[PDB]
């Protein structure tokens, strides 16, 4: 099949051959296939499903970044990414507590422009923490 490379300014999150992947996007989620149509796009707060050889998935949090599909070997660049068991349900629930406070504590437009991103971070974590259980 094909090779996937996942990196962030802090660490290399993954590197190796993979069977298929489902990845977040700017408008909506997208599934990549071997030899897929080459594309590049920014990604909204979410995660990526890494289904490797023999069908074993792992779940990587992608709080923000860009994905590249020009070659057969694909590439994910992450402004912030967290490995699926360094995070936990308690951490996403703390993010939920934070975001639900800031929604009540943001009252203008600029501060809501920040609280909405805080909420998006919390929601993407609350999503990946559930996907992690598979």
């Amino acid at each position: 099949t094909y090779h996937l490379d996942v990196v962030s300014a802090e660490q290399q999150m993954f590197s190796g051959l993979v069977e298929k992947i489902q990845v977040t996007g700017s408008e909506g989620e997208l599934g990549i296939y071997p030899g897929h149509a080459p594309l590049l796009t920014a990604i909204k707060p979410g995660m990526i499903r890494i289904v490797k050889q023999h069908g074993h998935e792992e779940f990587i949090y992608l709080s923000g970044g860009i994905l590249e599909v020009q070659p057969g070997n694909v590439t994910v660049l992450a402004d912030t990414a967290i490995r699926g068991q360094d995070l936990d349900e308690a951490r996403a629930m703390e993010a939920k507590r934070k975001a639900e406070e800031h929604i009540s504590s943001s009252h203008g437009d600029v501060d809501y422009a920040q609280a909405s991103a805080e909420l998006a971070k919390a929601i993407a974590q609350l999503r990946v923490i559930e996907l992690t259980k598979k």
């Binding site: 149509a37 594309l39 796009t41 920014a42 057969g72």
Partner: protein, 57 residues
């Protein structure tokens, strides 16, 4: 540049314009290419990350 624990080499290299005289990836070719809408912004921010990465490294 740190080529050895006890030897290092001084280097100069160009960032802009992003050199197209690098080896051409003639192997990867396609029958369809899709750019996500507002390609200018995505490409501009992507190149800003490129220059950020090169300078910081």
């Amino acid at each position: 540049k740190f080529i050895n624990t006890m030897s290092q080499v001084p280097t100069i290299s160009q960032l802009l314009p992003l050199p197209a005289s690098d080896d051409d990836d003639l192997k990867h070719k396609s029958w369809d290419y899709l750019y996500e809408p507002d390609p200018k912004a995505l490409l501009d921010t992507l190149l800003r990350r490129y220059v950020e990465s090169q300078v910081y490294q």
